[PDB]
């Protein structure tokens, strides 16, 4: 499916087809210094996204689920009207307003799982 052939396909279809999209995030060539600037910007963008996956303990392409419950105000949707019909673009067109909530809540999820493993790796 390449770089963007997953668009339009539903949630179940796009639960797969991740790596053939995500593997084409690195390239660069010469027309001038501006292209080097855009190349370094693309590398820094990919590295920042890999870092943000790095804090939450995901560290992979896998289906990284944390334990924080889903508040109803983020979607107000049934499971059937998320998985059976929706695709990712008009899902993002609903969920995208809560970034400062969700991207802090997963750092709170890695708050709630670290020292209570360090004690169980030392005091046990």
């Amino acid at each position: 499916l390449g770089f963007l052939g997953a668009a339009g396909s539903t949630m179940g279809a796009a639960s797969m087809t991740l790596t053939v999209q995500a593997r084409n995030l690195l390239s660069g060539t010469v027309w001038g210094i501006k292209q080097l600037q855009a190349r370094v910007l693309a590398v820094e963008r990919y590295l920042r996204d890999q870092q943000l996956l790095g804090i939450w303990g995901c560290s992979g392409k896998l289906i990284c689920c944390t334990n924080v419950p889903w508040n109803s105000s983020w979607s107000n949707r049934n499971l059937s009207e998320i998985w059976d019909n929706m695709t990712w673009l008009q899902w993002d067109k609903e969920i995208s307003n809560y970034t400062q909530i969700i991207y802090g809540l997963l750092e709170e999820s890695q708050n709630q799982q670290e020292k209570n493993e360090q004690d169980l790796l030392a005091l046990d």
Binding site: A7, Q21, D49, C64, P69, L106
Partner: peptide, 13 residues
């Protein structure tokens, strides 16, 4: 309930 999950490689423009 349901729980939050991240996905990487998502076709969003």
């Amino acid at each position: 309930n349901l729980w939050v999950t991240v996905y990487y490689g998502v076709p969003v423009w």
